[PDB]
């Protein structure tokens, strides 16, 4: 009864970890402007 | 055995979150200091 919510929420956690690690290892190179989570699909609009 | 741990009211009684000791905290502090100095030396020339 909560498959989609759980999946999108888990993807939110995954994206948070991804942003944290890319910020820690390579500071300032990539800045995230928008994050998009739907199903197992993930999208990012960023500035390089 | 020690009177200062006697609890007569439930105000000072609470849930247990975690537990630590000296042999863990000493190596934890050493690890923190070494990690800090290594990170500072690695981030800059």
């Amino acid at each position: 009864n909560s498959t989609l919510i759980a999946n999108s929420m888990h993807n939110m956690a995954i994206g948070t970890l991804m942003q944290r690690e890319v910020g820690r290892e390579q500071p300032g190179v990539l800045t995230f402007l928008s994050e998009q989570y739907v199903g197992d699909d993930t999208l990012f609009y960023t500035k390089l | 055995q020690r009177p200062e741990r006697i609890k007569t009211t439930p105000y000072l009684e609470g849930d247990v979150l975690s537990s630590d000791s000296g042999p863990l905290l000493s190596v934890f502090a050493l690890q923190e200091i070494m990690q800090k100095v290594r990170q500072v030396q690695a981030d800059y020339m």
Binding site: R20, E21, G23, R24, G28 | -
Partner: protein
């Protein structure tokens, strides 16, 4: 023998109310009197700003 300092990490975002409450707490959790100290002057300035 141990002095605290403020840490910032660009990869995280948090509710500013947490910072405000932490700034309130730091004024009565630590000691910076005339005998010894527990925090750096920069951390004291940050707590005052908070």
């Amino acid at each position: 023998q141990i002095i605290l300092d403020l840490k910032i990490d660009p990869g995280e975002r948090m509710d500013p109310a947490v910072r405000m409450v932490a700034g309130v707490v730091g004024h009565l959790l630590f000691t910076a009197g005339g005998r010894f100290t527990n925090l750096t002057q920069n951390m004291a300035r940050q707590l005052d700003i908070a």
